[PDB]
Amino acid sequence: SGFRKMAFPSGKVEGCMVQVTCGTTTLNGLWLDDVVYCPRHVICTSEDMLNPNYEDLLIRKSNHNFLVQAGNVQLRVIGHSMQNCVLKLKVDTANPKTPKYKFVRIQPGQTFSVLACYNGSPSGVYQCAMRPNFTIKGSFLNGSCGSVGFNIDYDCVSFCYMHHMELPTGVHAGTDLEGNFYGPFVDRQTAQAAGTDTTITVNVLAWLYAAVINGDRWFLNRFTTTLNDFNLVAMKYNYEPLTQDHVDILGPLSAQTGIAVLDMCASLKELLQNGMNGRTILGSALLEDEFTPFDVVRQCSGVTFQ
């Protein structure tokens, strides 16, 4: 029993972190095989942040300008290339700890674990979700750029985020491993704003299921409803519309608890309209939306990894 904000074991990723320095700028890089991936603005100085011309900046750099350290070991950069917003530094040595991996661009609502690093060294790990507005509510300080987000599928590590910046609202933005930003952001110091955020309805339902699985049933009722009537209420509260795909996705949990998805939607409807009334669900006073239906199954069934 029990329910926690569970992160994936970080071992396979820790072996891939390195330190990249170019001048006075130091940040993290991901070393897979003979390549080190890192944000391209590692070549910028405080003077270039406002409106950097990356092609130019990079053309004035030579392989010796890049100091890459893997622990006490220094890696020799034998080539470099820029792919969108990331730098790919070719090194003379293949990482012997390279796990089986793949790069993926996730969709909003999906969750992943973050290995926060500083100077090539892992400081900590936590779970978070890609918000509908393409930001994440992270925990990052100076020197954190380069830190990656990932998910583990059996024996494979799926990298899906590389950290780049913080917004005025204290939320964060980054890219996928191919250098493509998630959201409408750019890597330059110009006014940028994250859009209006909304609640991931499908995750909230998965969480209510987790609650039932763990014994909290006070919010349940006999009522029911339709996808149509539900979504009308949802929009009034800044919740993401619910689709048949989401309904099908919640299937396993509906089957496990015997509570029909549309029935659970009625419970939620009432929770939105009348609040929680000083009561809690799974130790919380707010409806949590950073647990995907799969996260719930994984934690309430005991799925392990290599």
Ligand X SMILES: *[C@@](O)(c1nc2ccccc2s1)[C@H](C[C@@H]1CCNC1=O)NC(=O)[C@@H]1[C@@H]2[C@H](CN1C(=O)[C@@H](NC(=O)NC(C)(C)C)C(C)(C)C)C2(C)C
Q: Which residues carry out catalysis?
A: 41, 145
Would you count residue 15 as binding its own copies (CB under 8 A)?
yes
165 binds, among ligand X, its own copies, none (CB under 5 to 8 A by kind): ligand X
Q: How far is the CB of 215 from ligand X (least distance, A)?
A: 13
**Nearest Cα residue to 182 out of 141, 238, 219, 138:** 138
- Tell me if 186 contacts its own copies by CB under 8 A: no
**Token pair recorded at residue 49:** 């942040």
Residue with tokens 């090194």: 91
H or E segment at 236?
A: helix 227-236
Of 166 and 263, which CB lies nearer to ligand X in the complex structure? Answer: 166
**250 to 269: interface string for its own copies, x by CB under 8 A:** --------------------
Q: Which stretch binds its own copies (CB under 8 A): 11-19, 74-82, 226-234, 241-249?
A: 11-19
- The residue ranges that bind ligand X (CB under 6 A) are 25, 27, 39, 41-42, 44, 49, 140-145, 165-167, 172, 187, 189, 192
Write the DSSP symbol of residue 284: B
Cβ atoms of 240 and 201 within 8 Å: the answer is yes
For residues 9 and 195, which CB has a smaller minimum distance to its own copies in the complex?
9
Q: State both tokens at 113.
A: 């674990």
Distance of alpha carbon 129 from alpha carbon 134, whole angstroms: 10
Q: Which does 300 bind (CB under 5 to 8 A by kind): its own copies, ligand X, none?
A: its own copies
Which pair of tokens denotes residue 102?
Answer: 């793949």
Dig out the tokens for 220 from the structure.
Answer: 């349940």
Is residue 214 at the binding interface for its own copies, with CB under 8 A as the rule?
A: yes
The token duo for 75 is 């890696």
Distance between CA atoms of residues 13 and 10, nearest Å: 5
Q: According to CB under 8 A, which one of 36, 42, 116, 261 is a site residue for its own copies?
A: 116
Nearer to its own copies, 7 or 106 (CB): 7
By CB under 8 A, name the one of 121, 221, 238, 243 that touches its own copies: 121
**One of 37, 118, 134, 185 touching its own copies (CB under 8 A):** 118
Site membership for its own copies, residue 277 (CB under 8 A)? no
Amino acid at 50: L
Beta strand 35-39 pairing with 77-83: unpaired
Contacting range for its own copies; rule: CB under 8 A; set: 42-50, 248-256, 265-273, 279-287: 279-287
Rg (CA), the chain: 22
